[PDB]
């Protein structure tokens, strides 16, 4: 295979490695993916030259490109060049047919032959987060390749997906003009990935930033933490559901917790009854008496989140009390105001009720969020005063992404962005090794969120009405 190196693959691959079913594409058409494949395969560095596109006899369909077929069962096709061998086809085109670049568009045998003889330098692979029935498969990529580029996660009504590139294996004034010493972070997330458009990299980079540059200082828990202050992350909720994929995150507890905030409950038995334990330790006899709540029942958590959302300013008594018509129903008012005046700049739910702090088991961590409406899409921004990057923050991202999607449905709006402000972002010293493993993992396409579309009031959502589809993740750490 002399002179047949540097061939580029384009392919779309399901989660179970299927690329074809009965000579057809095993999934419903992804228009986006064909826009992508076209754009990549027609690009000419900046007169009438074209790129070459090669496929096997099976691949049953291309404009503005040279088409080359590999068959031993046909030598004539309308419009196409035909060859019996890959060896023969590459040598011939590169000597006698003037072109820019050669792409390989498929048949498993074409891909296996291209891969087995080390003839491919680059693979543009559309990753689909779903298994599809099939009979034709993309061969395993040899350990000789790594992913160097990742796009944002996208989605259709039936799958989430992205594009990757696999490949084989700074001017002085930019340093001088910082004003600081001219002469490398101890930790870098996925150093091999050079084009880093997956939203999850926002999170990996922050982990890496805190471990590299955070100050080791103490805190209320006893265990110390590396800490740094001030970050902002954004997630496009029209596109994907930002549930982290570099480790497995379970959401059942997060969703029950959100629903419980929405019901305005301060009763921790409501969660335990569903075997949700997030809040258990903070409702126990020990923790309560230690924090001065001698006179309160176990699992009475005080006027925390849910109380503030539905009853801000009401006098708290106990978790059994009736607070209907008491205090200000922030959540209800703000949903109403979104429907009635989407341009309002005060679409805020504040849990940081300063008067009620002394009565709370834990003062709120996600203290404050604000909605925004622009072109019929709902955005949300949330302030998080204390941010556990090891264990906490990933649940918080999902929670407020789900809430925003919930509020958008009931208000008849599309989805914009969740913007998450982190104040004291920290990694506890015990988690340094878990995190080091995490930032080394290449992220999968994010999942999608599907809400029951019949639900028209925020109070009517239940756990079955909130489904995350197509969640592929690395193992739990």
């Amino acid at each position: 295979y002399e002179g047949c190196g540097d061939l580029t693959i384009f392919v779309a691959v399901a989660l179970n490695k299927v690329i074809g079913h009965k000579n057809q594409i095993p999934w419903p058409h992804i228009t986006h993916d064909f826009r992508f494949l076209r754009n990549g395969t027609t690009y000419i560095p900046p007169p009438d030259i074209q790129n070459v596109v090669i496929f096997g006899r099976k691949t049953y369909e291309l404009k503005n490109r040279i088409n080359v077929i590999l068959s031993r069962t046909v030598k004539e096709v309308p419009g196409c060049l035909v060859y019996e061998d890959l060896s023969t086809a590459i040598r011939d085109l590169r000597a006698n047919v003037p072109h820019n670049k050669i792409f390989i568009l498929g048949g498993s045998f074409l891909y296996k032959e291209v891969l087995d003889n080390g003839l491919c330098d680059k693979i543009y692979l559309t990753r689909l987060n779903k298994e599809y029935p099939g009979d034709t498969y993309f061969p395993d990529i040899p350990d000789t390749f790594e992913i160097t580029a990742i796009s944002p996660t996208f989605s259709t009504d039936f799958v989430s997906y992205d594009f990757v590139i696999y490949e084989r294996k700074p001017p002085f004034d930019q340093l001088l003009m910082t004003g600081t010493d001219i002469s490398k972070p101890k930790y870098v997330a996925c150093p091999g990935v050079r084009i880093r458009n997956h939203e999850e990299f926002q999170y990996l980079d922050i982990l890496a930033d805190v471990l590299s540059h955070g100050v080791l200082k103490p805190n209320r828990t006893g265990t110390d933490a590396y800490s740094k202050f001030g970050y902002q992350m954004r997630f496009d909720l029209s596109r994907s559901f930002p549930l982290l994929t570099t480790k497995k995150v379970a959401l059942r507890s997060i969703i029950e917790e959100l629903l419980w905030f929405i019901k305005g409950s301060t009763n921790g038995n409501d969660l335990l009854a569903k075997n949700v334990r997030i809040w258990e330790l903070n409702g126990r006899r020990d923790f309560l008496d230690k924090n001065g709540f001698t006179d309160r029942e176990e699992h009475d958590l005080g006027p925390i989140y849910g109380f503030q959302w539905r009853h801000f300013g009401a006098e708290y008594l106990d978790m059994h009390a009736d607070y209907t018509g008491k205090g200000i129903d922030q959540l209800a008012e703000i949903i109403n105001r979104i429907k009635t005046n989407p341009n309002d700049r005060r679409l805020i739910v504040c849990s940081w009720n300063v008067s009620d702090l002394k009565k709370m088991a834990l003062p709120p961590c996600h203290c404050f969020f604000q909605f925004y409406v622009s072109d019929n899409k709902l955005s949300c921004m949330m302030h998080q005063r204390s941010c556990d990057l090891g264990l906490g923050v990933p649940f918080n991202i999902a929670s407020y992404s789900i809430l925003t999607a919930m509020v958008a449905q009931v208000c008849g709006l599309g989805l914009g962005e969740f913007v998450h402000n982190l104040a004291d972002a920290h990694i506890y010293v015990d988690h340094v090794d878990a995190v080091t493993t995490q930032i080394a993992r290449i992220p999968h396409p994010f999942p999608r969120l599907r809400l029951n579309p019949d639900i028209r009031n925020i109070e009517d959502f239940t756990i079955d009405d909130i489904v995350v589809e197509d969640y592929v993740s690395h193992p739990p750490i």
Copy 2:
């Protein structure tokens, strides 16, 4: 001068253009400036370094310039000394360069001064690049750097730095994308309508954060109505940060009324809700919103003129108190958040709950305006105080520059009283907008090249935050472009 082009200048220059005084540096030494000059004049590209291991840069001066500059070929121009301890000497510049390039293997030639040498280099177009340390203070002197020809523009700006006695930055003046990066966005493969200072390619001045946001909102913001009747271009979610140990971020691209910012802050701190307290000091920030017509239109029909309700100050000092009117005595009532958080910082700086919140949901309806700067959080690490503030509604043209300054002063005040050094101010913008009638103003502003930021000096004797007065809060070395008129809508 055949073959005598691309000479590179390094120079340090006062606001009045003085580079020398009695053969001495006019200002107290800036060691940072020497390290900068050193690093710039001794740098060899690794390409060249590997193919010539011992190669050095050349550095030229006239006899006058009185310190050999290690790791460089020191060249010295004179007509009155034929040899110097370990240097090359020449009658004139012309021959120096010709000889150096013909017969003395070197990497790059730098011109380190004498006015006449700078003058000769500029006049004859021999220089392609100037590395200039800008000082925001005039100093007495007798040697000046020549005016820089209109043929040069600034292409790089460092962060603003400061010493005990001046603020300064570094700039570069100069004469005059891979396909996978585009494909892998997943979106269109093929320019924003507005770009701030497009000639500046290295953009480390912090003010660029604010200038880039102005351009972003103009380029991509959505025009939307609001409660003022004047519409605005609007976009959601930004974050800016300012290093308050290096400089005070008073915007330089327009003249900002510092005095009005300070009086307003002191007014918040005292917990006052009487707009007359500001008017009595000819500060008019709040006048429109305490007016009869505006109070009545928003239902505050039995309220006294310029009684603004339980806004900011009241919330900082008396959160949860019952508001009666602006004359009522509230001492002891409500929760004194400012006092308590100040106390928490001293007692336990690693507390993760150092929050002052003005967004009192129970009091929103009694307010003239619900607060725009809702909520701020303090943070300590390495004995440095940082602050993060959430602004729900951000008037980019008029309000935001005041906010940045206001909270930077506050963080400095709180730092001083807690015995802390200075960290960062971190500004979170939610609804960031440009009103339609500020569009020309801002387009003017974003083309202007930032000056180095000023410095903040607090009276060190003040130990309680309530004892600060305007004389105690000084901003030094403020250089700015002219003011830009903008209507309050």
